[PDB]
PDB file of all heavy atoms in Angstrom:
ATOM      1  N   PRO A  50      -6.045  19.091 -11.201  1.00  0.00           N
ATOM      2  CA  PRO A  50      -7.370  19.174 -10.538  1.00  0.00           C
ATOM      3  C   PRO A  50      -7.272  18.690  -9.088  1.00  0.00           C
ATOM      4  O   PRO A  50      -6.195  18.485  -8.563  1.00  0.00           O
ATOM      5  CB  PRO A  50      -8.244  18.239 -11.368  1.00  0.00           C
ATOM      6  CG  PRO A  50      -7.292  17.272 -11.996  1.00  0.00           C
ATOM      7  CD  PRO A  50      -5.982  17.995 -12.174  1.00  0.00           C
ATOM      8  N   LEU A  51      -8.389  18.505  -8.437  1.00  0.00           N
ATOM      9  CA  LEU A  51      -8.356  18.035  -7.021  1.00  0.00           C
ATOM     10  C   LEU A  51      -7.932  16.564  -6.961  1.00  0.00           C
ATOM     11  O   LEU A  51      -8.205  15.793  -7.859  1.00  0.00           O
ATOM     12  CB  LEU A  51      -9.788  18.204  -6.514  1.00  0.00           C
ATOM     13  CG  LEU A  51      -9.860  19.411  -5.577  1.00  0.00           C
ATOM     14  CD1 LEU A  51     -10.971  20.354  -6.043  1.00  0.00           C
ATOM     15  CD2 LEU A  51     -10.163  18.933  -4.154  1.00  0.00           C
ATOM     16  N   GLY A  52      -7.268  16.171  -5.908  1.00  0.00           N
ATOM     17  CA  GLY A  52      -6.828  14.751  -5.792  1.00  0.00           C
ATOM     18  C   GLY A  52      -6.255  14.283  -7.130  1.00  0.00           C
ATOM     19  O   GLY A  52      -6.664  13.278  -7.675  1.00  0.00           O
ATOM     20  N   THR A  53      -5.306  15.004  -7.663  1.00  0.00           N
ATOM     21  CA  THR A  53      -4.705  14.599  -8.968  1.00  0.00           C
ATOM     22  C   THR A  53      -3.414  13.810  -8.734  1.00  0.00           C
ATOM     23  O   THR A  53      -2.478  14.298  -8.131  1.00  0.00           O
ATOM     24  CB  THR A  53      -4.408  15.915  -9.690  1.00  0.00           C
ATOM     25  OG1 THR A  53      -5.621  16.623  -9.900  1.00  0.00           O
ATOM     26  CG2 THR A  53      -3.746  15.622 -11.038  1.00  0.00           C
ATOM     27  N   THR A  54      -3.356  12.595  -9.208  1.00  0.00           N
ATOM     28  CA  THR A  54      -2.123  11.777  -9.012  1.00  0.00           C
ATOM     29  C   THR A  54      -0.917  12.485  -9.633  1.00  0.00           C
ATOM     30  O   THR A  54      -0.939  12.875 -10.784  1.00  0.00           O
ATOM     31  CB  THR A  54      -2.403  10.458  -9.733  1.00  0.00           C
ATOM     32  OG1 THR A  54      -3.805  10.232  -9.776  1.00  0.00           O
ATOM     33  CG2 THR A  54      -1.721   9.311  -8.986  1.00  0.00           C
ATOM     34  N   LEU A  55       0.136  12.651  -8.880  1.00  0.00           N
ATOM     35  CA  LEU A  55       1.344  13.333  -9.429  1.00  0.00           C
ATOM     36  C   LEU A  55       1.921  12.527 -10.596  1.00  0.00           C
ATOM     37  O   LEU A  55       2.370  11.411 -10.431  1.00  0.00           O
ATOM     38  CB  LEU A  55       2.338  13.375  -8.267  1.00  0.00           C
ATOM     39  CG  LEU A  55       3.151  14.668  -8.336  1.00  0.00           C
ATOM     40  CD1 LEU A  55       4.336  14.576  -7.372  1.00  0.00           C
ATOM     41  CD2 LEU A  55       3.671  14.868  -9.762  1.00  0.00           C
ATOM     42  N   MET A  56       1.910  13.085 -11.775  1.00  0.00           N
ATOM     43  CA  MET A  56       2.457  12.351 -12.953  1.00  0.00           C
ATOM     44  C   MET A  56       3.758  13.003 -13.424  1.00  0.00           C
ATOM     45  O   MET A  56       4.010  14.161 -13.149  1.00  0.00           O
ATOM     46  CB  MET A  56       1.377  12.470 -14.029  1.00  0.00           C
ATOM     47  CG  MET A  56       0.238  11.499 -13.720  1.00  0.00           C
ATOM     48  SD  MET A  56      -0.517  10.942 -15.268  1.00  0.00           S
ATOM     49  CE  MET A  56      -0.258   9.167 -15.019  1.00  0.00           C
ATOM     50  N   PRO A  57       4.547  12.232 -14.121  1.00  0.00           N
ATOM     51  CA  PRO A  57       5.841  12.734 -14.641  1.00  0.00           C
ATOM     52  C   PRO A  57       5.610  13.696 -15.809  1.00  0.00           C
ATOM     53  O   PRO A  57       6.536  14.271 -16.346  1.00  0.00           O
ATOM     54  CB  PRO A  57       6.552  11.468 -15.114  1.00  0.00           C
ATOM     55  CG  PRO A  57       5.456  10.493 -15.403  1.00  0.00           C
ATOM     56  CD  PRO A  57       4.309  10.833 -14.486  1.00  0.00           C
ATOM     57  N   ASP A  58       4.380  13.876 -16.206  1.00  0.00           N
ATOM     58  CA  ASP A  58       4.090  14.800 -17.339  1.00  0.00           C
ATOM     59  C   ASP A  58       3.809  16.210 -16.812  1.00  0.00           C
ATOM     60  O   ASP A  58       3.732  17.160 -17.566  1.00  0.00           O
ATOM     61  CB  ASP A  58       2.848  14.220 -18.014  1.00  0.00           C
ATOM     62  CG  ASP A  58       2.528  15.028 -19.274  1.00  0.00           C
ATOM     63  OD1 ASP A  58       3.390  15.112 -20.134  1.00  0.00           O
ATOM     64  OD2 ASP A  58       1.428  15.547 -19.357  1.00  0.00           O
ATOM     65  N   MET A  59       3.657  16.354 -15.522  1.00  0.00           N
ATOM     66  CA  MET A  59       3.382  17.706 -14.951  1.00  0.00           C
ATOM     67  C   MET A  59       4.578  18.178 -14.120  1.00  0.00           C
ATOM     68  O   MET A  59       4.424  18.830 -13.109  1.00  0.00           O
ATOM     69  CB  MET A  59       2.150  17.531 -14.058  1.00  0.00           C
ATOM     70  CG  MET A  59       1.149  16.584 -14.728  1.00  0.00           C
ATOM     71  SD  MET A  59      -0.407  16.592 -13.800  1.00  0.00           S
ATOM     72  CE  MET A  59       0.314  16.620 -12.139  1.00  0.00           C
ATOM     73  N   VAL A  60       5.769  17.848 -14.538  1.00  0.00           N
ATOM     74  CA  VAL A  60       6.973  18.278 -13.771  1.00  0.00           C
ATOM     75  C   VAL A  60       7.994  18.932 -14.706  1.00  0.00           C
ATOM     76  O   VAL A  60       8.581  18.283 -15.549  1.00  0.00           O
ATOM     77  CB  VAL A  60       7.542  16.990 -13.174  1.00  0.00           C
ATOM     78  CG1 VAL A  60       8.674  17.332 -12.203  1.00  0.00           C
ATOM     79  CG2 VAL A  60       6.436  16.246 -12.422  1.00  0.00           C
ATOM     80  N   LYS A  61       8.208  20.211 -14.564  1.00  0.00           N
ATOM     81  CA  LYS A  61       9.192  20.902 -15.446  1.00  0.00           C
ATOM     82  C   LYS A  61      10.615  20.449 -15.106  1.00  0.00           C
ATOM     83  O   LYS A  61      11.243  19.728 -15.855  1.00  0.00           O
ATOM     84  CB  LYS A  61       9.015  22.391 -15.144  1.00  0.00           C
ATOM     85  CG  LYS A  61       8.866  23.165 -16.456  1.00  0.00           C
ATOM     86  CD  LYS A  61       7.585  22.724 -17.167  1.00  0.00           C
ATOM     87  CE  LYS A  61       7.805  22.755 -18.681  1.00  0.00           C
ATOM     88  NZ  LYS A  61       8.170  24.168 -18.986  1.00  0.00           N
ATOM     89  N   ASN A  62      11.126  20.866 -13.980  1.00  0.00           N
ATOM     90  CA  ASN A  62      12.508  20.458 -13.590  1.00  0.00           C
ATOM     91  C   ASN A  62      12.455  19.255 -12.645  1.00  0.00           C
ATOM     92  O   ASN A  62      12.452  19.401 -11.439  1.00  0.00           O
ATOM     93  CB  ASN A  62      13.094  21.677 -12.878  1.00  0.00           C
ATOM     94  CG  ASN A  62      12.187  22.076 -11.711  1.00  0.00           C
ATOM     95  OD1 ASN A  62      12.346  21.589 -10.610  1.00  0.00           O
ATOM     96  ND2 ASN A  62      11.236  22.948 -11.909  1.00  0.00           N
ATOM     97  N   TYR A  63      12.412  18.068 -13.184  1.00  0.00           N
ATOM     98  CA  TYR A  63      12.359  16.856 -12.317  1.00  0.00           C
ATOM     99  C   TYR A  63      13.541  16.847 -11.344  1.00  0.00           C
ATOM    100  O   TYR A  63      14.688  16.846 -11.745  1.00  0.00           O
ATOM    101  CB  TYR A  63      12.448  15.673 -13.280  1.00  0.00           C
ATOM    102  CG  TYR A  63      11.406  14.643 -12.911  1.00  0.00           C
ATOM    103  CD1 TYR A  63      10.340  14.384 -13.780  1.00  0.00           C
ATOM    104  CD2 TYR A  63      11.505  13.951 -11.699  1.00  0.00           C
ATOM    105  CE1 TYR A  63       9.373  13.432 -13.437  1.00  0.00           C
ATOM    106  CE2 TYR A  63      10.539  12.999 -11.355  1.00  0.00           C
ATOM    107  CZ  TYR A  63       9.472  12.739 -12.225  1.00  0.00           C
ATOM    108  OH  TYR A  63       8.519  11.801 -11.886  1.00  0.00           O
ATOM    109  N   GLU A  64      13.270  16.837 -10.067  1.00  0.00           N
ATOM    110  CA  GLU A  64      14.378  16.824  -9.069  1.00  0.00           C
ATOM    111  C   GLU A  64      15.007  15.431  -8.995  1.00  0.00           C
ATOM    112  O   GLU A  64      16.028  15.167  -9.598  1.00  0.00           O
ATOM    113  CB  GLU A  64      13.717  17.188  -7.739  1.00  0.00           C
ATOM    114  CG  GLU A  64      13.526  18.703  -7.658  1.00  0.00           C
ATOM    115  CD  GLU A  64      14.886  19.384  -7.496  1.00  0.00           C
ATOM    116  OE1 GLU A  64      15.724  18.829  -6.803  1.00  0.00           O
ATOM    117  OE2 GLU A  64      15.067  20.447  -8.066  1.00  0.00           O
ATOM    118  N   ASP A  65      14.402  14.535  -8.264  1.00  0.00           N
ATOM    119  CA  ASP A  65      14.967  13.158  -8.155  1.00  0.00           C
ATOM    120  C   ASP A  65      14.410  12.269  -9.270  1.00  0.00           C
ATOM    121  O   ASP A  65      13.637  11.363  -9.028  1.00  0.00           O
ATOM    122  CB  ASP A  65      14.513  12.650  -6.787  1.00  0.00           C
ATOM    123  CG  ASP A  65      15.071  13.561  -5.692  1.00  0.00           C
ATOM    124  OD1 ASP A  65      15.751  14.515  -6.032  1.00  0.00           O
ATOM    125  OD2 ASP A  65      14.809  13.288  -4.532  1.00  0.00           O
ATOM    126  N   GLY A  66      14.795  12.522 -10.491  1.00  0.00           N
ATOM    127  CA  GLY A  66      14.288  11.692 -11.621  1.00  0.00           C
ATOM    128  C   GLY A  66      15.464  11.234 -12.485  1.00  0.00           C
ATOM    129  O   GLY A  66      15.771  11.830 -13.498  1.00  0.00           O
ATOM    130  N   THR A  67      16.128  10.181 -12.092  1.00  0.00           N
ATOM    131  CA  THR A  67      17.284   9.688 -12.893  1.00  0.00           C
ATOM    132  C   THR A  67      16.799   8.766 -14.015  1.00  0.00           C
ATOM    133  O   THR A  67      17.581   8.115 -14.678  1.00  0.00           O
ATOM    134  CB  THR A  67      18.153   8.911 -11.900  1.00  0.00           C
ATOM    135  OG1 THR A  67      18.451   9.742 -10.787  1.00  0.00           O
ATOM    136  CG2 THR A  67      19.452   8.481 -12.582  1.00  0.00           C
ATOM    137  N   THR A  68      15.514   8.705 -14.232  1.00  0.00           N
ATOM    138  CA  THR A  68      14.980   7.826 -15.311  1.00  0.00           C
ATOM    139  C   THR A  68      15.351   8.392 -16.684  1.00  0.00           C
ATOM    140  O   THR A  68      15.380   7.683 -17.672  1.00  0.00           O
ATOM    141  CB  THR A  68      13.463   7.840 -15.119  1.00  0.00           C
ATOM    142  OG1 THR A  68      12.869   6.888 -15.990  1.00  0.00           O
ATOM    143  CG2 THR A  68      12.920   9.235 -15.438  1.00  0.00           C
ATOM    144  N   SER A  69      15.633   9.664 -16.755  1.00  0.00           N
ATOM    145  CA  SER A  69      16.001  10.274 -18.064  1.00  0.00           C
ATOM    146  C   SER A  69      16.386  11.744 -17.875  1.00  0.00           C
ATOM    147  O   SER A  69      17.496  12.137 -18.173  1.00  0.00           O
ATOM    148  CB  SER A  69      14.745  10.153 -18.926  1.00  0.00           C
ATOM    149  OG  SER A  69      14.876   9.031 -19.790  1.00  0.00           O
TER     150      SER A  69
END
Side-chain angles (χ1 to χ4, degrees):
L51 254 127
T53 299
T54 334
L55 215 192
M56 283 211 122
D58 185 58
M59 320 189 320
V60 188
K61 230 64 214 301
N62 56 89
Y63 226 113
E64 280 290 323
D65 299 1
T67 306
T68 188
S69 261

